[PDB]
Amino acid sequence: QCVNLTTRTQLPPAYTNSFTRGVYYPDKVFRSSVLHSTQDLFLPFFSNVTWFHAIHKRFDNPVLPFNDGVYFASTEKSNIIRGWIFGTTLDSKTQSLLIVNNATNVVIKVCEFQFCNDPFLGVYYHKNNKSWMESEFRVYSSANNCTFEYVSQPFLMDLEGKQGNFKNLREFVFKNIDGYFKIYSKHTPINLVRDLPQGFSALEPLVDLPIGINITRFQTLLALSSSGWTAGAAAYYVGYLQPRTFLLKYNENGTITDAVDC
Amino acid sequence: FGAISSVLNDILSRLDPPEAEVQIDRLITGRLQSLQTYVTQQLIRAAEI
Amino acid sequence: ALDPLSETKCTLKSFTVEKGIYQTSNFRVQPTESIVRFPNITNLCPFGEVFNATRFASVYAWNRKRISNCVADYSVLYNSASFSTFKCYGVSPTKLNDLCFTNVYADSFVIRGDEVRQIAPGQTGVIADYNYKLPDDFTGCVIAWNSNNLDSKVGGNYNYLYRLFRKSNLKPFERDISTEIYQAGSTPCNGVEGFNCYFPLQSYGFQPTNGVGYQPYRVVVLSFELLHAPATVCGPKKSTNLVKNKCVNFNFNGLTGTGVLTESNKKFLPFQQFGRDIADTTDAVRDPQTLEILDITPCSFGGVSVITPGTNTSNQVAVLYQDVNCTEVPV
Amino acid sequence: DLCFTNVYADSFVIRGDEVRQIAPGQTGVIADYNYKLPDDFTGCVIAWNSNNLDSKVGGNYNYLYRLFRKSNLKPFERDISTEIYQAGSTPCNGVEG
Numbered sequence: 001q002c003v004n005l006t007t008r009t010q011l012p013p014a015y016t017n018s019f020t021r022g023v024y025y026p027d028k029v030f031r032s033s034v035l036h037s038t039q040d041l042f043l044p045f046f047s048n049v050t051w052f053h054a055i056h057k058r059f060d061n062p063v064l065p066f067n068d069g070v071y072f073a074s075t076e077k078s079n080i081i082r083g084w085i086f087g088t089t090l091d092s093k094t095q096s097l098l099i100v101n102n103a104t105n106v107v108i109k110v111c112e113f114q115f116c117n118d119p120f121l122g123v124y125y126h127k128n129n130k131s132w133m134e135s136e137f138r139v140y141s142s143a144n145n146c147t148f149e150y151v152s153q154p155f156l157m158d159l160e161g162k163q164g165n166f167k168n169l170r171e172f173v174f175k176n177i178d179g180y181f182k183i184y185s186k187h188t189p190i191n192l193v194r195d196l197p198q199g200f201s202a203l204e205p206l207v208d209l210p211i212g213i214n215i216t217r218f219q220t221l222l223a224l225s226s227s228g229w230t231a232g233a234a235a236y237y238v239g240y241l242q243p244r245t246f247l248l249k250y251n252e253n254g255t256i257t258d259a260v261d262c
Numbered sequence: 263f264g265a266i267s268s269v270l271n272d273i274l275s276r277l278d279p280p281e282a283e284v285q286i287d288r289l290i291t292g293r294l295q296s297l298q299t300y301v302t303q304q305l306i307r308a309a310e311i
Numbered sequence: 312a313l314d315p316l317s318e319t320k321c322t323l324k325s326f327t328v329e330k331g332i333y334q335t336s337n338f339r340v341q342p343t344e345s346i347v348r349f350p351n352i353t354n355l356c357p358f359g360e361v362f363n364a365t366r367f368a369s370v371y372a373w374n375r376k377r378i379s380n381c382v383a384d385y386s387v388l389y390n391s392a393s394f395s396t397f398k399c400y401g402v403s404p405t406k407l408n409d410l411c412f413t414n415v416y417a418d419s420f421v422i423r424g425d426e427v428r429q430i431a432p433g434q435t436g437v438i439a440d441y442n443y444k445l446p447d448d449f450t451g452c453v454i455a456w457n458s459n460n461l462d463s464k465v466g467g468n469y470n471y472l473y474r475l476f477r478k479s480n481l482k483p484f485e486r487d488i489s490t491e492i493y494q495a496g497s498t499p500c501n502g503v504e505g506f507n508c509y510f511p512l513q514s515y516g517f518q519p520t521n522g523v524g525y526q527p528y529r530v531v532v533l534s535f536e537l538l539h540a541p542a543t544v545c546g547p548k549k550s551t552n553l554v555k556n557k558c559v560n561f562n563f564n565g566l567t568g569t570g571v572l573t574e575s576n577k578k579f580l581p582f583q584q585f586g587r588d589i590a591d592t593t594d595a596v597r598d599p600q601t602l603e604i605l606d607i608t609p610c611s612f613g614g615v616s617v618i619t620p621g622t623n624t625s626n627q628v629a630v631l632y633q634d635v636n637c638t639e640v641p642v
Numbered sequence: 643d644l645c646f647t648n649v650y651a652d653s654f655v656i657r658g659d660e661v662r663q664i665a666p667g668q669t670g671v672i673a674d675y676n677y678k679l680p681d682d683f684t685g686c687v688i689a690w691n692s693n694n695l696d697s698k699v700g701g702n703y704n705y706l707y708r709l710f711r712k713s714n715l716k717p718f719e720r721d722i723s724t725e726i727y728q729a730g731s732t733p734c735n736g737v738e739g
Binding site: 025028029030031032034148178179180204205210212253254255 | 379380540541543577578579580582583584585586587589595
């Protein structure tokens with residue numbers, strides 16, 4: 001079961017300036033207080049990123065292409081984004097990948113699905129016991145063939161919270177080279193209204209996984225009866241990567257402190 | 263220098279003694295040329311000093 | 312090589328050498344022993360669930376199971392002579408514990424004792440063309456052991472049965488689950504029973520009182536494939552004990568070299584494994600088993616200066632070891 | 643037009659399918675167990691089938707080749723030893739096991 005929620009306010013997309021964002025560690029070599037030049041795919045400084053948000057009237061989960069790795073930043077409260085879709089054609093014609101950062105587990109797989117037009121999850125709002133219980137899991141229509149699945153330790157994370165300033169600045173960047181998928185991540189306690197901030201920070205490597213498939217497009221997952229809804233306030237930004245050359249400054253403690261676009 | 267890798271060992275640890283000498287030849291040619299360029303530079307500046 | 316004076320004579324290509332100082336014989340501490348290190352990589356592949364499983368299915372319904380993302384120890388199955396045969400086809404059997412794959416597929420079933428030779432690739436027969444076929448350039452291994460005391464009864468276990476009637480020969484790794492009553496003749500047929508219309512599945516006489524060749528044999532087929540995808544199960548990363556403070560030669564996670572190992576206090580980032588120089592030489596390695604910082608230094612070297620007077624005057628010579636505190640002179 | 647100290651004529655009979663392993667620097671069971679040629683080689687290789695000469699329908703089973711060895715062999719080394727090779731980690735004695 002999966003239905004199409006339509007009741008929204010209609011708005012055009014927006015752009016934002018990615019000032020100095022989208023740097024990471026491309027390797028595992030340690031340096032201390034070293035200036036070193038490297039050539040690789042990055043976000044060039046002072047480019048434009050696409051800005052999307054979910055408010056109250058906005059419930060925006062489009063389909064976006066994944067080429068050369070993409071940059072995904074989110075300023076959020078109460079963890080509204082939960083999942084991620086990847087695939088060439090996303091509809092059992094080519095094998096495709098799923099991420100769910102569930103309230104209990106984290107569910108990680110590559111299989112052969114037929115995802116819906118608007119997959120989403122729906123958590124109920126204050127259903128007489130003051131606790132938001134998750135009830136709706138509307139992702140796929142089937143699961144035909146599978147090659148890799150993984151589920152980790154179950155854990156606990158909140159499904160409730162209302163703040164006017166988004167606290168979670170979750171930066172992610174995803175790459176796929178020769179079947180190895182690299183996810184670099186960062187969480188930041190942020191105090192900002194509706195913008196992406198100014199600053200410099202690299203991203204540690206979080207996930208490296210050898211699948212070996214082709215990906216063209218992606219989509220994320222947002223949290224919420226089947227008509228009429230209330231989605232928590234959140235905002236996110238989407239950017240692309242290009243081949244460039246950079247310079248990296250390593251400090252005494254061994255951390256990237258600055259980079260220079262060439 | 264157009265050879266397979268910059269480690270002597272990795273060429274030795276992956277290829278055959280009927281094969282690897284071509285790579286080693288490339289390595290010693292490039293490094294030897296750089297060294298001879300260096301001694302030219304230093305000897306000219308020595309004349310200057 | 313008799314004395315340093317002869318070394319100077321032999322490198323200046325003369326028999327008399329005039330008074331002065333000469334630079335000859337760069338030396339080195341000559342590394343003494345081997346070492347290999349690999350992580351505490353104990354996460355094994357389930358060989359016991361595909362070999363020491365309590366029951367296999369029959370040959371018409373051969374069990375296929377894929378193994379990936381673990382450590383495979385083929386040796387404990389290789390050295391065991393408890394199995395009736397081990398016929399590997401694409402790989403030399405000693406290379407199995409040094410070469411490795413990107414996928415594992417295992418097909419376990421039970422066949423007759425005399426039918427164990429049709430499992431060879433490209434062959435013909437009842438099993439080889441009616442039940443399970445191997446391709447002409449098959450990559451894998453076929454492992455068989457008798458299990459007459461495991462799943463054979465004196466009454467006759469007729470639940471193990473094979474395929475006797477089949478319309479066409481099978482492509483490799485195909486499964487014929489159909490029980491359609493085959494028309495071995497040209498006459499049309501229907502119903503449950505008819506003339507020249509045999510049920511395709513025909514029973515084995517697995518009893519322990521039958522002779523050799525008529526006993527149940529558990530047979531498993533490994534159909535791994537090579538050099539086409541990123542390797543997912545490898546297994547054999549053998550490491551020996553850790554030594555320090557001597558010139559050795561090492562293998563740390565495929566990184567081979569020679570030198571001396573020292574405790575260091577550099578602050579590696581937890582994902583960082585190497586630490587290199589301003590001009591890019593590896594001198595900082597995190598030990599794969601227990602995470603600790605190892606400074607790598609190439610053990611000492613230096614040229615030898617020879618001071619001589621005139622050979623016309625004397626043959627008594629002196630040796631300068633340069634840039635070396637002579638605490639370790641002899642090598 | 644050339645003159646030599648002496649020449650070696652080395653003769654045998656093999657299966658045809660393995661003929662490619664005769665070049666110096668090659669590998670494989672023939673090249674690595676029973677016959678090995680050094681890589682400084684200066685001579686020629688010559689092959690012809692003798693299918694109508696020796697190949698009998700009953701089977702020419704005096705044609706043995708060495709299929710196991712503990713180690714590789716030197717160039718221009720010839721082995722005749724019929725001691726039993728052990729493959730598994732189990733040591734063996736006597737003749738068969």
